[PDB]
Design a protein around this ligand. Structure first.
Ligand SMILES: COc1ccc(O)c(-c2nc3cc(C(N)=[NH2+])ccc3[nH]2)c1
Lengths: 245, 9
């Protein structure tokens, strides 16, 4: 995240950190995700697309730091990895970029509620906030496009949703953005999501609840003028989500 | 005890 503040998981208790193992000894970070229900985490298919081996991923809940342990964290293996059939990538955009990971702990259970682990609410069918709404995004992604390392502390920032009309302007993204995507930017192009934040949540308040309105998906550069970050519009995937959850 | 989606506190 460019800009933002450093935070702790108590502030984003539904954020999930997904790592990949290289038995060479290291486990590296892959993407973020959100806990929908005790056994299901939702992320982005593009995070897995290249190495769809569920057995090598580890999911942690209740984690405030990237490579050091947080007291209260839970570790899970991925029992099912559901990528979106029809996912497609082009020169920028990812289409149908949503994935579901069913988690199981070594004891055979799903997540348990604590002060650092909570689910986030889903929107109702095709129900979104109106452009202008401020939502927050969280993650362990880069702090600057030139960085080649990810921060160790979890960060968060607030961004505003913009209309499709604004985002589909030719000098923004044109038609690369569809109705199944949402764009969000900082009025001052000062804060934004970046490489490493893919899969994490775009949370807004909808009908009184903190709702998972988008999934961090793509964007040209990070915190660039007229280049908002694009998110998968969760409200348009509700049937898909239910067919599997 | 049980989850309450969206609730931090
Ligand atoms: C360079 O290779 C990769 C690999 C995985 C990614 O998720 C990304 C990535 N770029 C990203 C850019 C943005 C943004 N708003 N500008 C958000 C998430 C991203 N994730 C880049």
């Amino acid at each position: 995240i460019i800009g933002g503040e450093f935070t702790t998981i108590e502030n984003q208790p539904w954020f999930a950190a997904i790592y990949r193992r290289h038995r060479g000894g290291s486990v590296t970070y892959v993407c973020g995700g959100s806990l929908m229900s005790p056994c299901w985490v939702i992320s982005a298919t593009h995070c897995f697309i290249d190495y769809p081996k569920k057995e090598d991923y580890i999911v942690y809940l209740g984690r405030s730091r990237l490579n050091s342990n947080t007291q209260g964290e839970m570790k899970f293996e991925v029992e099912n990895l559901i990528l979106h059939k029809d996912y497609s990538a082009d020169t920028l955009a990812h289409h149908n970029d949503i994935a579901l990971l069913k988690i199981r702990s070594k004891e055979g259970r799903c997540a348990q509620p604590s002060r650092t682990i909570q689910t986030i609410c889903l929107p109702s069918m095709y129900n979104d906030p109106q452009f202008g709404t401020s939502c927050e995004i969280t993650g362990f992604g880069k702090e600057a496009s030139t960085d080649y390392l990810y921060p160790e502390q979890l960060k968060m920032t607030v961004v505003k949703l913009i209309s499709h009309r604004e985002c589909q302007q030719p000098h923004y993204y044109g038609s690369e953005v569809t109705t199944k995507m949402l764009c969000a930017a900082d009025p001052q192009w000062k804060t934004d999501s970046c490489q490493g934040d893919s899969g994490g949540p775009l949370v807004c308040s909808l009908q009184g609840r903190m709702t998972l309105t988008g999934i961090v998906s793509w964007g040209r550069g990070c915190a660039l003028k007229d280049k908002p970050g694009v998110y998968t519009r969760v409200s348009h995937f509700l049937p898909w989500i239910r067919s599997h959850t | 005890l049980k989850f309450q989606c969206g609730q931090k506190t």
